[PDB]
A paper describes a structure:
Cryptochromes (CRYs) are a structurally conserved but functionally diverse family of proteins that can confer unique sensory properties to organisms. In the marine bristle worm Platynereis dumerilii, its light receptive cryptochrome L-CRY (PdLCry) allows the animal to discriminate between sunlight and moonlight, an important requirement for synchronizing its lunar cycle-dependent mass spawning. The α-helical region contains the binding pocket for the major chromophore, flavin adenine dinucleotide (FAD), which is required for the light response. Here, we solve the structure of both dark state and blue light-illuminated PdLCry using cryo-electron microscopy (cryo-EM) in combination with single-particle reconstruction techniques.
Numbering used by the authors:
A (entry chain B), B (entry chain A): 31 to 556
Write the structure that this text describes.
Amino acid sequence: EHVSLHWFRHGLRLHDNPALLKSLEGAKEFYALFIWDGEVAGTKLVSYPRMKFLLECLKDLDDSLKKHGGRLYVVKGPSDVVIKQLIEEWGVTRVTCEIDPEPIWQPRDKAVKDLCATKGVKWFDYNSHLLWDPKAVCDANGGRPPHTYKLFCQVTDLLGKPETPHPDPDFSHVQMPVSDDFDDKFGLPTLKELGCEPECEEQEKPFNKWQGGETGALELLETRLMIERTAYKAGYIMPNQYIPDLVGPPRSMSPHLRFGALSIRKFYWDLHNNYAEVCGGEWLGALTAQLVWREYFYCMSYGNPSFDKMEGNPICLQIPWYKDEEALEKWKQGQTGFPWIDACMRQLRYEGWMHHVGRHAVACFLTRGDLWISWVDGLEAFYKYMLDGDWSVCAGNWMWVSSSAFENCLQCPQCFSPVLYGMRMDPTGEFTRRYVPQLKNMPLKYLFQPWKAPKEVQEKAGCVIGEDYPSPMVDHKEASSKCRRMMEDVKSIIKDPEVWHCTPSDTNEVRKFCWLPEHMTADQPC
Amino acid sequence: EHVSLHWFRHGLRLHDNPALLKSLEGAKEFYALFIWDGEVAGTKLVSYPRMKFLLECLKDLDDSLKKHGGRLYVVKGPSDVVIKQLIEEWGVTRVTCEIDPEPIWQPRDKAVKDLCATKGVKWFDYNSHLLWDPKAVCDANGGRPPHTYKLFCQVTDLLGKPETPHPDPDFSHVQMPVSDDFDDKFGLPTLKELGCEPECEEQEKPFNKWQGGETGALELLETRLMIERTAYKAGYIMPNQYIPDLVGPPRSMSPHLRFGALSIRKFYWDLHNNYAEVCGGEWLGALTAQLVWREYFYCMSYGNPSFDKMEGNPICLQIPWYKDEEALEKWKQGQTGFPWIDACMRQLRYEGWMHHVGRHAVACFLTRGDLWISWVDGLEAFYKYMLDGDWSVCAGNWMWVSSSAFENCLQCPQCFSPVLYGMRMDPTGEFTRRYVPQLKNMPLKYLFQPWKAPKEVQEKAGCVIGEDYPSPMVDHKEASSKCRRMMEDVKSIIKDPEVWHCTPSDTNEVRKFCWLPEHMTADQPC
Ligand SMILES: Cc1cc2nc3c(=O)[nH]c(=O)nc-3n(C[C@H](O)[C@H](O)[C@H](O)COP(=O)(O)OP(=O)(O)OC[C@H]3O[C@@H](n4cnc5c(N)ncnc54)[C@H](O)[C@@H]3O)c2cc1C
Ligand SMILES: Cc1cc2nc3c(=O)[nH]c(=O)nc-3n(C[C@H](O)[C@H](O)[C@H](O)COP(=O)(O)OP(=O)(O)OC[C@H]3O[C@@H](n4cnc5c(N)ncnc54)[C@H](O)[C@@H]3O)c2cc1C
Ligand SMILES: [Mg+2]
Ligand SMILES: [Mg+2]
């Protein structure tokens, strides 16, 4: 005895969706809706790659719904008017949705609820995007979010464990009306009208291909689980990670987690059950350690709309930065003069995805390594091009890498160098040569230092530095010393080391974060 | 109206076994048998690792049979008497088996058939170990086996395609009698009585762990197929292989193929069906190119008992080798003085498995690179320690790498060097340091050349060359020139380049065989 409506904003899936399950029980009619308003799902500041991903996900969702005998409605316009129009037209009595924990989505929702309060329309919301409730974690640690990963783990180890996934829905006993001339009015838009077209030939035909949806997410999860099972049988339980693979398929699910095409609880429990089936029945929490950084960065933004800025944000230190547009433009385009940085930036601009080590390298190069430019300026590029540009996680990582004044392990000019780090992470040079073809014939000895090669080598390789490939934009030795002095001044000004701010816990945490050995080794420069 | 007996020698499996399926139709009783005679399945010249693998496979087979209500009989003694005893005791009327294509297993079988001819006992055999019949291939190319891989492919492309796998058996309508006190008389032996015990502490606790059986083979096949599916979706169809992974799990099925725990036809067809499901319905023969080298080397031994020797073998060239026992013992133990060679040899002696590049490197070092010692001497070690020491494939690979006088690409001292090749295949040095702990603290600069380091570096690293780690056993520059001169003399003596002998087809085949680029590159020494 209800006419229910489920609103799709995130969580574009049908598995493990309690809010959807609640809209089918005691329901005479059912409608599925998505509203295109220009701000939902990071559409305001976006580019071609992630638009393709979003459209593919929506098409997959509609195709999945067509099996049970239903369609997905897409409407263009403000939510506060679209909802009212649909209520007055269809005759809706109940609206169900999933919660958006970020503070920038709150005033949107508060407007709808009030409306439903003045028309006798029930409202239902359920949190299925995170493992723990941010408010409970904040209350357990006084009234402020934890500022350390170890403290966050300690706090969450007392609240309990996540809940198991829910079953799948059933549409057999519910009517799902569909209007005539549906594809002409409630159909899905196209990139041709929205104004997003490829900016270069590399976007049209990238080296690595991505597909959005839910079936691909489930297949990737199955492949991940069986790879781990085979590794466990071989004898590899949580081994040290030192050699990243940059020339093969990524096999990543972060873009799917961002949009909600895969459940976090399902992944969490599948990992542990897979481990227990093979080995004994002892609990090992190190398996799901990566999934806890995501929650640690999500819960930190609770109650702070200025979490993406340096001014007015109480959990960030104030640091005097510089502003030069030429350097920033060179960094964004990929004309810095260091092949390791340029390759990663061009990969981001073409495909929209990058490995962790590259992101750390480019962030350190921009902020506290050589140039001394604010992280707010570089965060915009990641918001614009990344496939998984979460509003809170990216800003949290930027503030973690930079602005940590009292951590001296991140200020070393030898370990975090745009030459030695690239040599370590790409001994062969195939990744560098793939995205910088100008240095295809350059010997591996001078591949990362093209300006130290003689003229005969340049002529033979067909790359004269200064005409075919730009000269370096800065001297690392000189820039590093002045940046170190400037940060030492910041430390002197901020006397107390125990201030409340986002920072790493210890040095080993940094070394593991950056894929480097903990103890001293014979291959450690300074 | 029969009492059938299936004899297990190879093909220790229940899936895709036509001979087994034939012993169940029209049968009143059924017996499964394995005879331990001291020569079956490479038991005469064997060590602890492969014995463990064989025993695990037999235990898995017995456990699988116990589900349907049957056991596996194991008897110790000569086959020609055991078969007769069992025929006179049980009352057998039909014997079924699988064919062993190698010529060393023929006189064993010819004795049994004759017996069955004088007692009214039917005999049935079926070839399920190979994809093509060696006799048909030999007849299609005159009366001799093809001596080139391209010629073998050309010949086999006209015979047709392999047959699809057969169904699984059923034991419901067949009686499977079991005797009392079974575990006391027909039980499985143990390594404790056979005389195989670990020779060192590294055998007891190896770094990589192996398990024999059929379930593991099927799981490995599933993992392989889904990895390939994901790679195809990403956009990687038959890419160039240049970076081997030596610090992770092997994920190999060659030992299972050797003993017959996995079918070759099933793998062949699963690969192609997996490819067709994702991509279009066009045939691509490059997918199963590795499975054809195995058949090429198997069919070459047809009609030649001396295929494992240099004297009396018509498909091998006669070359004057040297004989020094000290050098051979150093090569076998792993005291050569070159860490790249020692690590691979110690890995073989501990675990029993090695990557292709290491096998090629050590074979070239022994035979035609530096020492000039016969391949027959080194083949014995591989027969003794390898988990997949096939009688014909290993000898064929040895004769392919060595004795190819007219192929000058394999005679280059720069590309196939025990220093540069190791640097190329192990840029980090983790694999080398895992099996040569004496050089754990040695800098990566001198890791592959410990004798060129100063004394202070040796003292700091705690490795004085000559006392803690042996000095090099030979000078590569001098050895290479004399070996080249000696092989040039062989070429001068053997005038005709078109002699009938096992040899590579072209230079690109060698370069791909050894995981090296085809065209010239800036990182090519000579
Ligand atoms: C400057 C910078 C910005 C980043 N921005 C993002 C972002 O917007 N979104 C994002 O998901 N990751 C972000 N990361 C973390 C990291 O770059 C990605 O999580 C990485 O690409 C995951 O790849 P993977 O799935 O193969 O790793 P895996 O370890 O195989 O994936 C496990 C999962 O754990 C989570 N995870 C792992 N590391 C982190 C981390 N440091 N912070 C948060 N979650 C993590 C992700 O959901 C990931 O899918 C950023 C890192 C840096 C240095
Ligand atoms: C001196 C020497 C001796 C060798 N002895 C053997 C041996 O006794 N048994 C053996 O199976 N391989 C042998 N090989 C080939 C090679 O070393 C192994 O096939 C390799 O370990 C296969 O690993 P993989 O399964 O990961 O390779 P994959 O390519 O992933 O395996 C595909 C399959 O193709 C077959 N195959 C691949 N290459 C060859 C080859 N060159 N010759 C024959 N079959 C091949 C194997 O059955 C293998 O399982 C030898 C090579 C050399 C240089
Ligand atoms: Mg992932
Ligand atoms: Mg294999």
